Amino acid sequence: AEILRAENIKKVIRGYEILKGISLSVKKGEFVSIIGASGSGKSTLLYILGLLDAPTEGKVFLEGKEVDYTNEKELSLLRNRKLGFVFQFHYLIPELTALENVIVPMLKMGKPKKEAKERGEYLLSELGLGDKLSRKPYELSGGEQQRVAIARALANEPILLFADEPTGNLDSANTKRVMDIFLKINEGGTSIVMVTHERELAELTHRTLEMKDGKVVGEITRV
Amino acid sequence: AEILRAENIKKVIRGYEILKGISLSVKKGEFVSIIGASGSGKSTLLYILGLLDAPTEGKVFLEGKEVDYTNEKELSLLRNRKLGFVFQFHYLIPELTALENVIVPMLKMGKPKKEAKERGEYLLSELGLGDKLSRKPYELSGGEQQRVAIARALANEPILLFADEPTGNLDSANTKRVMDIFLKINEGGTSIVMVTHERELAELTHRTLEMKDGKVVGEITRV
Ligand SMILES: [Mg+2]
Ligand SMILES: [Mg+2]
């Protein structure tokens, strides 16, 4: 039940081939991790798979349909409708409450405000922030802000979450809390593709792609 | 040449007096730091001085005029016109370039786009990011993102910068780079009030207020 495929993806950045021909697929419901040395192309690949950057060569298919990277507005539309993102950085809006931050993407897509606020409240309860709904981000710790960002990532019921180093800058306890959140999300059926520096975190996922110098050099599958 | 004064500031949060009666002033051009144990009220004070939160009791005067905290829109107006903010977190907008992120506040105040973009480019050059103008935030490291945030803080030519733990999550080299940036800004004449966990950073400032249990308990002046 493919949800994502890449075919012969290459990416040139400043005259160098950062990605050198990658093909992969991801099934609906799968938790896939990507590991490899710094400069291997892991984040570059994730940004292409997540419709943030276009490939130089190759094709990407989302839910079995080829992605057209040539109209920015239409690409943003598809991305906002289908995908959610978590990064090391939380990109909260500091003048808005934790609740308001979560419903932003829903309002953007035209979801009615009542319905949107209820969803933002369900999501935030789900992620241990029911008590911080009205808090502004500069009041929240990094770990709490990550939980706001994950709630927001789930706002439009995405079919795929992309996570780029989601536990960076997080202590042990918050790293475990956030990884457990991802595990529970994936259990509910949402696919996740996660780039990580931590092999111990990759070990908790169903499949790991190992990268080196812009190629996939290894694949690890865990049952 | 007073730029800021607080008179008998108290702040009740969830039925407890977090700030218990604080009076202070800051002169134009001064670099003031605030230190003290966790729970001393340092960040709470900074948010009131920076017009982000209202006091429960007391008065704040900015450029010798009493601040009215009762109309949110008018308070936001004054804050956006006069003050800039740096936090441990960078609050960048990840779909916008480093340049676009800096001019946001200028456009908000009605500054023409050409003039705004030139300023955003001057500021970013000034802070070692001239080469990252078109980079999206998820490409930038935490240290670089802080430099984008400091540029943005300077966008409307504020009379006062407030910095809350601006070097948290930053390594040694970036901590020094960011502190040096603050020192250069202050040299140019901009006042800065900075909350920090690091006494070694407070030692580089002109004056330090020491807090304990919601009061100023000590003051250190350095020439
Ligand atoms: Mg991680
Ligand atoms: Mg600091």
Curated annotation (Swiss-Prot), chains A, B:
Protein name per its UniProtKB record: Lipoprotein-releasing system ATP-binding protein LolD
Record-annotated membrane-spanning stretches: none
Subunit structure: The complex is composed of two ATP-binding proteins (LolD) and two transmembrane proteins (LolC and LolE).
Protein's gene: lolD
Listed SUPFAM superfamilies: P-loop containing nucleoside triphosphate hydrolases
GO molecular-function terms, A-Z: ATP binding; ATP hydrolysis activity; transmembrane transporter activity
Gene Ontology terms: cellular component: plasma membrane
Family annotation (CDD domains): ABC_MJ0796_LolCDE_FtsE
Family: Belongs to the ABC transporter superfamily. Lipoprotein translocase (TC 3.A.1.125) family.
Domain ABC transporter, first and last residues per copy: 4-223
Residues annotated for ATP binding in this entry: 36-43
Listed EC numbers: 7.6.2.-
Sorted UniProt keywords: ATP-binding, Cell inner membrane, Cell membrane, Membrane, Nucleotide-binding, Translocase, Transport
